[PDB]
Amino acid sequence: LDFLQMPAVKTSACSMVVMDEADRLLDMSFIKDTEKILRLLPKQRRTGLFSATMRSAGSDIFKTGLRNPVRITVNSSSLKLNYCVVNPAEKLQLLVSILNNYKFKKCIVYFPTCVSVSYFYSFIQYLGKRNILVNEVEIFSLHGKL
RNA sequence: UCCAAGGUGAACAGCCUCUAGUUGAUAGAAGAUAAGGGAAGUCGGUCCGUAACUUCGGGAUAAGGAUUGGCUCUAAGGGUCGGGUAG
Numbered sequence: 094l095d096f097l098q099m100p101a102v103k104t105s106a107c108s109m110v111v112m113d114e115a116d117r118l119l120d121m122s123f124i125k126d127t128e129k130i131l132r133l134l135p136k137q138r139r140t141g142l143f144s145a146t147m148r149s150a151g152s153d154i155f156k157t158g159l160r161n162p163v164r165i166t167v168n169s170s171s172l173k174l175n176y177c178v179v180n181p182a183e184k185l186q187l188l189v190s191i192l193n194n195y196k197f198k199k200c201i202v203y204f205p206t207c208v209s210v211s212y213f214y215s216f217i218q219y220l221g222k223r224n225i226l227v228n229e230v231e232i233f234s235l236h237g238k239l
Numbered sequence: 240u241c242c243a244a245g246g247u248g249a250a251c252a253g254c255c256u257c258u259a260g261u262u263g264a265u266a267g268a269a270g271a272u273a274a275g276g277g278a279a280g281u282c283g284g285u286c287c288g289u290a291a292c293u294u295c296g297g298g299a300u301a302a303g304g305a306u307u308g309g310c311u312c313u314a315a316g317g318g319u320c321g322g323g324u325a326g
Contacts, residue, residue: 095314117312126313206310237312 094126097133104134112157115142116150124156131158185213193226207236 097104110131112118118127140157144150148166179187188202204210214234220226 098314120312122312208308 094130097130107134107138109139109141110134110157111141111143113143114145115154115157116144116146119150119153119156124153128156185216189217189220189226192230193228204236207238210234210236 096102112127117123136158137160138158140159140162142154142157142159147154147164154162177187192200204213211234214232217232221230221232
């Protein structure tokens with residue numbers, strides 16, 4: 094959006110727009126920016142929306158400006174879906190009890206916020222300094238505010 | 240045919256006054272109420288006590304007396320500088 098708003102860039106010859114994860118880009122948060130981005134670009138074009146949950150963005154696909162569209166749905170136990178019901182104050186401990194006991198090559202642990210990612214990363218590193226968990230595990234943190 | 244102050248009224252009205260005009264018109268003296276009866280008459284009888292609310296802007300970001308720190312992704316968030324031990 095910042096790039097297209099610069100006067101040095103002309104958008105008149107564009108003839109192809111693709112939105113990957115189009116259900117996420119038409120979300121309530123992203124709709125403000127994508128509306129402007131599509132506003133700058135010419136209306137007569139070919140649009141391709143691609144998303145693994147494209148059905149959820151039900152009537153918001155026409156906000157993109159489809160002209161001659163064809164919806165496409167592709168369908169096929171690959172993986173296990175479990176859940177644990179525990180007291181919150183134990184939750185982090187349970188995480189540790191999974192990291193040093195389960196068998197894996199890569200484990201991805203999701204956190205709600207970025208500050209939580211940094212804070213718990215530092216505390217788990219401190220625990221590993223004291224050898225609370227003993228394994229050939231290398232721990233990284235990656236949030237989107239970096 | 241032109242000009243046209245204010246206050247009360249808190250209902251055009253009426254009342255009072257500011258500026259400005261008058262003191263003109265022979266002079267002196269000496270409708271209302273009603274006891275009892277009630278048509279017997281005549282042709283004809285706005286202010287005291289409650290409660291909720293309630294005006295303009297600026298603010299964005301969950302609050303606004305408290306210990307303020309407040310979501311995920313996504314353009315920019317003042318400038319600059321700086322990293323070990325050895326040969």
